[PDB]
Design a protein around this ligand. Sequence first.
Ligand SMILES: CO[C@H]1CN(S(C)(=O)=O)[C@@H]2CC[C@@H](OC)[C@H]1C2
Length: 284
Amino acid sequence: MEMEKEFEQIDKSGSWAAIYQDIRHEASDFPSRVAKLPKNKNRNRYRDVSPFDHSRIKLHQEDNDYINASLIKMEEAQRSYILTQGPLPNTVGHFWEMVWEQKSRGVVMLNRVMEKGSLKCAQYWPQKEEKEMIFEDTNLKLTLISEDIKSYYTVRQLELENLTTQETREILHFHYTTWPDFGVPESPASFLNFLFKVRESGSLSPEHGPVVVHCSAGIGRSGTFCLADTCLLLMDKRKDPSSVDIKKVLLEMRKFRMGLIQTADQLRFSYLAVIEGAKFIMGD
Ligand SMILES: CO[C@H]1CN(S(C)(=O)=O)[C@@H]2CC[C@@H](OC)[C@H]1C2
């Protein structure tokens, strides 16, 4: 079926939970043996969220190459994304090592450091220009260059230096700051505006390594971001945009990381975002 009318048909019939459970039943199951090794317990935020072995990002290190991060490679859309958990106190150096080694331009953050009164990720970037951060375990230096605070999101320019080679690179930090502590946003308008700002920066384009996207577990809000982006790109590429099947795209993405889209409300919100976004692209 088309999307917008399949949407109204699920709303009127109140069957979002059944649609979402079907997706959960059909989703791929691949091994994640490296994630479960005892030496990696303090590298995982949640015991039930792990990268598959076949798609995990490897650190360029001979001691321990493990990080909780997955490469989502979308062949028809010609887009790739790295989805990862919010960094832990003992993985902030690994996080920036990955950004460096994978040649990423941008980092997309969809959570606040504290939500619901608890810590959801480490404070892994510097908050003042004159107070830079040094990660001694991976030999990297990180400096805040500029910060632009807007009503729904903040964009930061960062300098990452490989202290071993003295090479430097500019990284863009795109921080969506207004996702509610409970539920999903009422309108997708600010989320779509944010997606378009990431696109306009070059951070999603083939001349760079894959964008790094995270929330707390790296599957819920993060899944919503890449699902909406890929679906909109396919609608632009194809002769028949109504042939884009958001459930089929989501199942394709779940071949590369488990659990993407965590609730039926997140699934409904993803439909809403793609529907509204397809009107703004055109032609109007
Ligand atoms: C768990 O409640 C869900 C179920 N569905 S439903 C009745 O299947 O349409 C709706 C989708 C949005 C969601 O909000 C959480 C609610 C309402």
